[PDB]
Design an enzyme around this catalytic site. Structure first.
Site, PDB file in Angstrom:
ATOM      1  N   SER A   1     -26.545 -14.493  80.670  1.00 40.96           N
ATOM      2  CA  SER A   1     -26.789 -13.073  80.445  1.00 40.96           C
ATOM      3  C   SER A   1     -26.600 -12.342  81.769  1.00 40.96           C
ATOM      4  O   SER A   1     -26.065 -12.893  82.735  1.00 40.96           O
ATOM      5  CB  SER A   1     -28.189 -12.828  79.869  1.00 40.96           C
ATOM      6  OG  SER A   1     -28.286 -11.540  79.279  1.00 40.96           O
TER       7      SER A   1
ATOM      8  N   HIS B   1     -31.090 -13.261  65.152  1.00 39.71           N
ATOM      9  CA  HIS B   1     -31.401 -14.684  65.158  1.00 39.71           C
ATOM     10  C   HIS B   1     -31.666 -15.164  63.737  1.00 39.71           C
ATOM     11  O   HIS B   1     -32.077 -16.310  63.529  1.00 39.71           O
ATOM     12  CB  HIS B   1     -32.611 -14.983  66.048  1.00 39.71           C
ATOM     13  CG  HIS B   1     -32.553 -14.333  67.396  1.00 39.71           C
ATOM     14  ND1 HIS B   1     -32.690 -12.974  67.577  1.00 39.71           N
ATOM     15  CD2 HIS B   1     -32.379 -14.861  68.631  1.00 39.71           C
ATOM     16  CE1 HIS B   1     -32.600 -12.693  68.864  1.00 39.71           C
ATOM     17  NE2 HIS B   1     -32.409 -13.820  69.525  1.00 39.71           N
TER      18      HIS B   1
ATOM     19  N   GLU C   1     -40.197 -12.971  64.635  1.00 40.47           N
ATOM     20  CA  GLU C   1     -40.779 -14.170  64.050  1.00 40.47           C
ATOM     21  C   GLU C   1     -42.210 -13.894  63.611  1.00 40.47           C
ATOM     22  O   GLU C   1     -42.872 -12.981  64.110  1.00 40.47           O
ATOM     23  CB  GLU C   1     -40.742 -15.349  65.035  1.00 40.47           C
ATOM     24  CG  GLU C   1     -41.084 -14.996  66.478  1.00 40.47           C
ATOM     25  CD  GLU C   1     -40.729 -16.099  67.454  1.00 40.47           C
ATOM     26  OE1 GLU C   1     -41.225 -17.231  67.278  1.00 40.47           O
ATOM     27  OE2 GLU C   1     -39.966 -15.834  68.406  1.00 40.47           O
TER      28      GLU C   1
ATOM     29  N   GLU D   1     -34.831 -22.506  62.419  1.00 41.81           N
ATOM     30  CA  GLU D   1     -35.340 -23.835  62.757  1.00 41.81           C
ATOM     31  C   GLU D   1     -36.508 -24.291  61.881  1.00 41.81           C
ATOM     32  O   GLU D   1     -37.029 -25.388  62.103  1.00 41.81           O
ATOM     33  CB  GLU D   1     -35.799 -23.875  64.221  1.00 41.81           C
ATOM     34  CG  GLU D   1     -34.698 -23.711  65.263  1.00 41.81           C
ATOM     35  CD  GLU D   1     -35.231 -23.809  66.689  1.00 41.81           C
ATOM     36  OE1 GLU D   1     -36.258 -23.157  66.988  1.00 41.81           O
ATOM     37  OE2 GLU D   1     -34.630 -24.537  67.507  1.00 41.81           O
TER      38      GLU D   1
ATOM     39  N   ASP E   1     -44.631 -11.595  65.952  1.00 40.31           N
ATOM     40  CA  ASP E   1     -43.844 -11.363  67.154  1.00 40.31           C
ATOM     41  C   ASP E   1     -42.837 -10.267  66.838  1.00 40.31           C
ATOM     42  O   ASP E   1     -42.312 -10.227  65.721  1.00 40.31           O
ATOM     43  CB  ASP E   1     -43.128 -12.640  67.596  1.00 40.31           C
ATOM     44  CG  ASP E   1     -42.351 -12.464  68.883  1.00 40.31           C
ATOM     45  OD1 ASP E   1     -42.338 -11.346  69.433  1.00 40.31           O
ATOM     46  OD2 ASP E   1     -41.748 -13.451  69.345  1.00 40.31           O
TER      47      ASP E   1
ATOM     48  N   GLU F   1     -47.199 -11.292  69.679  1.00 37.99           N
ATOM     49  CA  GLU F   1     -46.209 -11.472  70.728  1.00 37.99           C
ATOM     50  C   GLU F   1     -45.309 -10.251  70.798  1.00 37.99           C
ATOM     51  O   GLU F   1     -44.817  -9.775  69.771  1.00 37.99           O
ATOM     52  CB  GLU F   1     -45.369 -12.727  70.468  1.00 37.99           C
ATOM     53  CG  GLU F   1     -44.229 -12.951  71.445  1.00 37.99           C
ATOM     54  CD  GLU F   1     -43.532 -14.284  71.227  1.00 37.99           C
ATOM     55  OE1 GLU F   1     -43.961 -15.049  70.337  1.00 37.99           O
ATOM     56  OE2 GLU F   1     -42.541 -14.561  71.934  1.00 37.99           O
TER      57      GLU F   1
ATOM     58  N   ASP G   1     -43.514 -10.471  76.582  1.00 34.27           N
ATOM     59  CA  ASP G   1     -42.383 -11.124  77.234  1.00 34.27           C
ATOM     60  C   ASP G   1     -41.940 -10.422  78.510  1.00 34.27           C
ATOM     61  O   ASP G   1     -42.037 -10.993  79.600  1.00 34.27           O
ATOM     62  CB  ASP G   1     -41.187 -11.197  76.282  1.00 34.27           C
ATOM     63  CG  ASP G   1     -39.874 -11.425  77.013  1.00 34.27           C
ATOM     64  OD1 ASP G   1     -39.657 -12.542  77.522  1.00 34.27           O
ATOM     65  OD2 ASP G   1     -39.056 -10.483  77.079  1.00 34.27           O
TER      66      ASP G   1
ATOM     67  N   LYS H   1     -41.449 -18.289  79.609  1.00 32.29           N
ATOM     68  CA  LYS H   1     -40.085 -18.795  79.505  1.00 32.29           C
ATOM     69  C   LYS H   1     -39.633 -19.353  80.854  1.00 32.29           C
ATOM     70  O   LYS H   1     -39.553 -18.616  81.841  1.00 32.29           O
ATOM     71  CB  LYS H   1     -39.167 -17.659  79.064  1.00 32.29           C
ATOM     72  CG  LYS H   1     -39.441 -17.133  77.654  1.00 32.29           C
ATOM     73  CD  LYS H   1     -38.502 -17.731  76.608  1.00 32.29           C
ATOM     74  CE  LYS H   1     -37.356 -16.779  76.288  1.00 32.29           C
ATOM     75  NZ  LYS H   1     -36.617 -17.196  75.068  1.00 32.29           N
TER      76      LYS H   1
ATOM     77  N   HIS I   1     -39.608 -22.184  74.806  1.00 37.45           N
ATOM     78  CA  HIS I   1     -38.341 -22.885  74.943  1.00 37.45           C
ATOM     79  C   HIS I   1     -37.201 -21.883  75.126  1.00 37.45           C
ATOM     80  O   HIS I   1     -37.403 -20.665  75.126  1.00 37.45           O
ATOM     81  CB  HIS I   1     -38.078 -23.752  73.712  1.00 37.45           C
ATOM     82  CG  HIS I   1     -37.766 -22.966  72.478  1.00 37.45           C
ATOM     83  ND1 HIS I   1     -38.379 -21.768  72.179  1.00 37.45           N
ATOM     84  CD2 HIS I   1     -36.902 -23.210  71.464  1.00 37.45           C
ATOM     85  CE1 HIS I   1     -37.901 -21.305  71.037  1.00 37.45           C
ATOM     86  NE2 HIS I   1     -37.006 -22.162  70.582  1.00 37.45           N
TER      87      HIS I   1
ATOM     88  N   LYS J   1     -44.759 -22.287  73.045  1.00 32.93           N
ATOM     89  CA  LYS J   1     -43.941 -21.794  71.943  1.00 32.93           C
ATOM     90  C   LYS J   1     -42.611 -22.535  71.963  1.00 32.93           C
ATOM     91  O   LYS J   1     -41.815 -22.363  72.891  1.00 32.93           O
ATOM     92  CB  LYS J   1     -43.731 -20.282  72.057  1.00 32.93           C
ATOM     93  CG  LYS J   1     -42.612 -19.731  71.187  1.00 32.93           C
ATOM     94  CD  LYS J   1     -42.482 -18.226  71.332  1.00 32.93           C
ATOM     95  CE  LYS J   1     -41.320 -17.694  70.508  1.00 32.93           C
ATOM     96  NZ  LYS J   1     -41.253 -16.209  70.524  1.00 32.93           N
TER      97      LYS J   1
END
Lengths: 436, 436
Positions: free
Chosen positions: A43, A156, A165, A206, A244, A293, A320, A345, A373, A396
């Site tokens: 990024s 995502h 999420e 996932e 989240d 979150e 975050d 993170k 992750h 997480k």
């Protein structure tokens, strides 16, 4: 020698989805064996532990990292050598105050993380002692409590859902040895609900779902029914849920409100600053809810107050962007006086020294350090080992879709058995300052 | 016992999508602690190797491997001390006598493989040699070749297609490093179209997708055309493809005829044994193939004799469910020309030494071998180094868009860095079974 250096080697490897990374051999003679690397994600345009890439056609479609590796592989030979690897700080902190870039790298943030990872590993499994337990004194025992995923959103996700999420937890869990079954169960048992009623044919992430679902407000049947006859009770006691909301996604700075009409239908109303907050608080009031979150951008300096103003001793909020474990921002959380959790993170914090400094700095007041992750991951469980070493508390890692996360879970259980007696989880004090 | 292979220590560990497995450690009287582990997979009935799974339904629906772990620790712990100081075969190949069952179910193929891997990966413990060097061949410098699943099918097919999984294959890179790119570049080309297609972009845990076509005058055109747009050529002067036919299943046992009205729309088209090979006769020539897995059924005896007489030098007859990697089954195929290659499954065969012996015997009968991915994907990359050890090279490695698949190359690039000087690329002339 074991105390002087005259020889080393290093190289590069591939990672998940095709974002290769670093690999350095910092051994002493044939007196060391282990591994060293770091996960990655490409990024730019933000003060992350931003990552350096090559772009040359020969460097794996322009996605190689040998160019960032070159900053180390070109100017060492026998010239700069003279420092040791025993001195963790001599590598960690003597480096930063030579470059001092704002976004955590000119020679590489991922490089400076992987190098110190190798530094920590160079004698961990040599000592015949677990990695986490020896980086200072002996005081690292707690496996970070895992918070699991049930839903995903945004790009995502395969369907148009806004919130990145939703998450639930095993708050009833006695110990990890047996607890390893719970999370695997919640993922295995995601194919048997629809029939009680008649519902939709779509697939998901996932271990979270992305449905062609009519409205945000109705996201109940696909989750609560697959909480009850997922094998476990749901209600509002014994078991909890979480959310989240992708903080730094969209903010109408031109009008001092937020917006959520991206994913709300054309027949929906204007969801605001307060309509966002009050909609989460609705399930905070009459839903089993503690953990939250994100939701508020890089600079929601005042906004991070809000989710702990009246949503006081009843929830726990992870942020975050404004926290990212970064030192300056982790300090400014105090200046705002109302932070309560942080996101860790691994490729947002850099060196392990800063990692543990910021982690303890946060957890002192009760902050739950969520080591999260990343897409680009390797076969090592370095991230979860760091989380254990710094006694972060929360982790997480999505769900059991990917074997590189399964590897983290397996390594942590191996660690538990090496510990022997660790049936530890802090009960309600896991979220600590709570009475609701 | 200063130099006697003394101690062991196994345990129960995990793998892809929540399935338990086993990990083994073998200690020497020198300072060894080496770790290693094996993937998951089980069956019963015929000669196929069989796992021992815990009877407790709690332990992953009875998929616990703790009984295999006990078979290691409470039995093998006394059968390793006192034996020869140095003898690869005597040390490793002696487990069938202890088990008492040909399929190796009582002790466990997974546990036996872990026991072998412990000593085989004891290089830095005390061997002075790498695993490929140790396992029976010293100076091999052979590199892998991926067959990867990117489009799913078989059991997932309510559409007018059947194929279990498409395998795309790189063959013709300029040198040994570039082969990785020549195969990796294709998933990006498929994603270039699929995302804009949206025609159910269902992602499987393999890392692929399940798209649909409509009919003939285009259906397959895109296979040629998209790689043309990417610039990569097609055929044995370019990119080639292989199919996992899953013949042994689709060939209805109760009727014994390749009636493809099963997965295709009801109608007229149907293929018999004497008419099936024209399927390939029309397919391969305009769309070339390199590797076919289990080309046709095992209950069809009289009728395997058209392919090897018509295109028998371009279509590799990789036999997996014809051989199940077992010595007796592989000798069957050898005895009377049912195929020209073997698929290896290390967790099926049981030991690294058995795998090396099977590859050696295949070489003695002119059979090329191929290691293969299994459903329970490990993070340990030992399972794939045996192919380089025996110069088998090719591997089935799932979809390289994920970490379970990437880790094997993340390991083997270390081997590729270690060839020596004599690694001139054999490449398209590596095969000995083909191009007689």
């Amino acid at each position: 020698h074991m105390s002087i250096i005259t020889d080393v080697y290093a190289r590069e490897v591939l990672d998940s989805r095709g974002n290769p990374t670093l690999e350095v051999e910092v051994y002493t003679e044939s007196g060391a064996f282990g591994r060293g690397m770091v996960p990655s994600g490409a990024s730019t345009g933000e003060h992350e532990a931003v990552e350096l890439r090559d772009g040359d056609k020969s460097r794996y479609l322009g996605l190689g990292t040998q160019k960032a590796v070159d900053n180390v592989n070109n100017i060492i030979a026998e010239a700069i050598i003279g420092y040791d690897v025993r001195d963790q700080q001599a590598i960690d902190r003597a480096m930063i105050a030579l470059d001092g870039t704002p976004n955590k790298g000119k020679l590489g943030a991922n490089a400076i993380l992987g190098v110190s990872i190798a530094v920590a590993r160079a004698a961990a499994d040599y000592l015949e002692v677990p990695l986490y337990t020896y980086l200072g004194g002996f005081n690292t025992k707690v496996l970070p409590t895992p918070m699991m995923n049930i839903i995903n959103g945004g790009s995502h996700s395969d369907a148009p859902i806004a919130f990145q999420e939703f998450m639930i937890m095993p708050v009833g869990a006695p110990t990890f040895k047996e607890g390893l079954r719970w999370g695997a169960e919640v993922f295995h048992a995601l194919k048997k609900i629809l029939k009680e009623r008649g519902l939709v044919t779509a697939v998901g992430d996932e271990g979270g779902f992305a449905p062609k679902f009519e409205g945000t407000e109705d996201g109940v049947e696909t989750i609560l029914k697959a909480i009850e006859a997922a094998g476990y009770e749901a209600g509002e006691n014994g078991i909890m849920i979480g959310f989240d909301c992708a903080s730094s996604e969209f903010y109408d700075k031109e009008r001092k409100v937020y917006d959520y009409t991206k994913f709300e239908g054309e027949g929906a109303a204007v969801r605001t600053s307060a309509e966002q907050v009050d909609y989460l608080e609705e399930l905070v009031n009459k839903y089993p809810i503690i953990t939250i979150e994100d939701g508020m951008d890089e600079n929601d300096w005042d906004g991070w107050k809000v989710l702990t103003e009246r949503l006081g001793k009843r929830v726990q909020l992870v942020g975050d962007d404004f926290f990212v474990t970064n030192t300056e921002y982790l300090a400014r959380g105090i200046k705002e006086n109302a932070a309560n959790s942080i996101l860790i993170k691994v490729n947002q914090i850099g060196t392990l020294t800063e990692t543990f400094e910021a982690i303890e700095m946060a957890k002192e007041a009760g902050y739950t350090a969520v080591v999260s992750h990343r897409s680009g991951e390797t076969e090592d469980s370095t991230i979860a080992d760091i989380a254990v070493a710094t006694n972060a508390g929360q982790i997480k890692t999505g769900s059991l879709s990917r074997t590189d996360r399964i590897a983290k879970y397996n390594q942590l259980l191996r660690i538990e058995d090496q510990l022997g007696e660790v049936a530890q989880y802090k009960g309600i004090k896991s979220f600590y300052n709570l009475k609701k």
